[PDB]
Design a protein around this ligand. Structure first.
Ligand code: NA
Ligand code: NA
Lengths: 234, 236, 234, 236
C-alpha cells in the first residue's frame, strides 16, 4: 500500500504527520471529526474518514476505507480534545478521547495489520501514540491530561510486548509545548511566554518536528515499546 | 482524625481500615457492600454505600466522615476491591470492558480525590504543618485487553500523582500512590493462587493485604512522603 | 542478632537511621571515617568500624566486626561526600564514594547475609541504598551527583532480581533536601530559602524521617527492587 | 560542521560516523585504535587516538576537530566500543572491574561532554537557534557483577542527561542519550549470537549498528529532541 491512519489528521500534529507520510510515499486516511476541506486539498492519496475515536463502529469504517486504498500498516494516534484554557464530565471526556480512543484505534487497527504479509520480511506495521500534557500549571483539566498521558505511557510497553508475535511495533511520542490550534484560545503574547519557558529551543515546537519523529520511528525497526519525549527539555 | 477508605470492606481496603482503626482514626468504609464487615469492626467504623464515580454518593460518604470528626485521610482502594469484581469476573474481552475499568480507576480516583481535597483543605492544620493525606492505589493486575486496561489504569493514577500533589501543596495535603503487585485478596483454586505467587521474585508469594495497610499508615505517619508512587510488589 | 551495618552512620541520615535501628532492637555497626565519639555515646549496641566504603579490605573488616556482634541481616548505605557549595578528580571522587562504595558494601554484605538462616523463614536480610541529588541548580558537582544517583537507581531492580534466590531484598531511598551537615557550608538563610522551595512540607527534611522510612522498608517484606522518593514533591 | 565520534572506529560509533559523513559532516574518530578504518573512510574523516578519561588526549581530539571546521556534534560511543573490549574480554568478576567499567562510562562520558561543550558554547549559532548537540550512549549489556556494572553505568549516563541539558540550554547545546539494547558489533559463535537475538521481542534479532546511527542523525536533525533518553531495543 502502504496505508497509514492518522487520527486527528486534519490539524496540528496530525496534519503535519499526514503531510510527512504523503511525502514519504504512503497513502493516508485522515480519521477526524472535521477538516474534510483540508484533506481534499492534499489530493487523492489522502482520504477523509469522519469518525470519533471513542466510537468503535466509526473507527472500523475508517479502517475499512484504509483497506480499500492499499495495505494498512501504520497508525498514528494524534486525536486530542480541549483547548488550553486558564467537572467530572469534562475529566471523563478528555480521558475518553485521549486514552480510550487511542486504545480503540490501536486494538482495532492491530487486528487488521496482523493479517498482512510482512514486508527482510521482518515487519507488518507500526502503531504510534501521542501522550499529551497540559500546556501550563493551573490549566483547566490538568489532572485529566496527566491521567490520560500516564495511561498512554503505561500501556506502551505491555502492548508492544503483546503485539511482538504479530510483528507490530508500538511506540509513543510525548510532546511538550507545540504550536497547534489547541493553544489558539490563549492570546499571542501568552503563547510566546510559554515558548520562552522551554529550555532549548526556547520556543513552541513546530508540528513538522513531531511529524519528522513519527516518520523516523516508522523507518527505524529497532524502536519498540518506548516513549520519546519531544519537548526541548521542559 | 477520620479516614475514608474506598473499597474498605475487603482486601487492601479492609486491611488498611483495620490498621487505621488500631492507630486511633475513625474510618468511613466507602464500598458497594460490606455492612456486616463494618459492623464487625465496631463503633469507630461506619459504612457508606457508594460507587466512587457517583458524585452525590461520594459527597454523602464525606458528609458522614465530617459528622464523626475531622476528615484528614483518604485511601482509595476501590480499584482493587468489590467494585472491580463484576467488571472482571467474566473476563475483559471488549472495548466496553476496557472503558469501564479505566473509568472506575481514573475517574473514580479523581472524583474521590477532588471531593475529599475540597473538605480537607478547609480543616485546621495539625508543627501545624499538615491538613491531610490522600493515597491512591494504582490498579492490581486476564488476556491482552485486560492487560491494557490494567496498564492504562495504573499509568493514569501514577500520572496524576505528582501534578495533584503540586496543586494541593499550598493546602498542606499530601498526595501519594501505592502500586501493588500480586496480592491475596478475595478477588483471586489453591494451585492457581500458588502459581501466581511463584512468579514474584522475593518474597515469592502473594502479598498480604496487611503489608499494603502497613505502608499506607507509614505514608500517613511520614511527613516527607509526597508526590510519589511506591511499588509494593516483591520486585515483580 | 540482628546486626545492621550503616555506612555514613555517624552523622546526618546515617546517624538518624542508626538510632532508629537501635530503638527497634537491632545492633548496629557504624561504618564511617570519623564520629567514633558520637557512636561511643550511643552505647555498646552500636559499634564503630573505621572504613572508607571505596576500600574493599576496610569494608570487609567492618563486616567482620558486625559478625562478632550477631547475625548480619541489614545494610543501609548512607555514606556520601562533598558539602553543597555554590574537576574530573572531583567528579570521580563523588562517583567513587556514592556509587562504587555503595556497590562495594552491597556486594560484600550480600555474600555474608546469603549464608545466614532465614528468619515464616522467608527473609535473610535487606540492603537499602541512598540515591542522593544536588541540593540546588548550579551546585558545584551537580552532574556527578546526578550520575551517582542515576547509577544507584539503575542498579536497584537488577540487583534485587539477582539476590531474590538468596532472600535478600534490595531497596533505595531517594531523599530530597534534608537538614544534614552536608548543607552546613551554606549560610542559614540560604538553607531556609531551599526548604521553602519544597512544595509540601515546605522545609528541610528531618533525618529521622529518612530513618523511619528505612525501618519501615526493613519491616515490610513486600518492598523490593524499588526506589522511594522522600522529598516533599520537589 | 564537524563531529567527534568516540568509539568511532567500530560498531555503533563507526555506523554513526558513516551516517554523519553521508550527511555532510566531517568527523574526528576518537578511539584507542582504528587508523586503517579511518583511512578507508576517506578525506573527511580523521583519527585521534585517545582514552575518553584522558583530559589531554580528548582536548587534542577536540583541537583536531576545530582545525577541520566548526565543532557542533559529539556522539559518545566509547562505552560500547574498542575501549570496553579488554575491560570485559576476560569477564567482570571483581570490584576493580566494576569500577573500571563505571569509570569509562560515567567519567569518560562526562569528560568528553564537559570539554566538548566548552568548545561548542563558543561557536556562532546556525533560525540561529542551535550551536550544537551532544549525544551519549547508555552502556550496552556476563554474570551478576557484570550486570551491576552495566546497570550502574547506564543509570549514571541516563541520570546526567536532563540536568546537563538544562545547564547547557542557555548555550544552545542539546544533550540527548541513546540507550541501546542488544546490537551486532564486533564486541560479541553464530549459535550464541542467535540465542541473544531471540530474547528481543520484536524485531527478534540483534540491532544493526546502522539503526543506532540513523537515530543519532535524526536527533541531530530534530531541534526539539532535548534532555531525553531514547531506548533503542526492540522492547527488550
Ligand atoms: Na517509587
Ligand atoms: Na524515552
Amino acid at each position: 500500500d502502504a496505508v497509514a491512519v492518522v487520527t486527528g489528521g486534519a490539524s496540528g500534529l496530525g496534519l503535519a504527520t499526514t503531510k510527512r507520510l504523503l511525502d514519504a510515499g504512503a497513502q493516508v486516511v485522515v480519521l477526524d471529526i472535521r477538516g474534510e476541506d483540508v484533506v481534499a486539498d492534499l489530493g487523492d492519496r489522502a482520504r477523509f474518514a469522519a469518525a470519533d475515536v471513542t466510537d468503535e463502529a466509526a473507527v472500523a469504517s475508517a479502517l475499512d476505507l484504509a483497506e480499500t486504498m492499499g495495505t494498512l500498516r501504520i497508525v498514528v494516534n494524534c486525536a486530542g480534545t480541549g483547548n488550553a484554557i486558564r467537572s467530572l464530565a469534562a475529566f471523563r471526556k478528555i480521558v475518553d478521547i485521549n486514552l480510550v480512543g487511542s486504545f480503540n484505534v490501536l486494538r482495532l487497527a492491530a487486528e487488521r495489520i496482523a493479517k498482512t504479509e510482512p514486508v527482510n520480511a521482518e515487519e507488518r506495521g507500526v502503531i504510534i501514540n501521542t501522550a499529551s500534557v497540559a500546556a501550563f500549571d493551573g490549566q483547566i483539566g490538568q489532572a485529566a491530561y496527566s491521567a490520560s498521558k500516564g495511561g498512554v505511557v503505561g500501556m506502551t510497553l505491555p502492548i508492544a510486548r503483546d503485539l511482538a508475535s504479530h510483528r507490530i511495533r508500538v511506540m509513543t511520542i510525548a510532546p511538550g509545548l507545540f504550536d497547534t490550534p489547541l493553544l489558539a484560545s490563549l492570546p499571542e503574547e501568552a503563547r510566546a511566554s510559554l515558548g520562552k519557558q522551554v529550555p532549548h529551543p526556547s520556543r513552541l515546537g513546530n508540528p513538522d518536528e513531531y511529524g519528522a519523529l513519527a516518520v523516523h520511528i516508522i523507518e527505524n525497526p529497532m524502536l519498540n515499546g518506548e516513549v520519546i519525549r519531544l519537548d526541548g527539555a521542559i
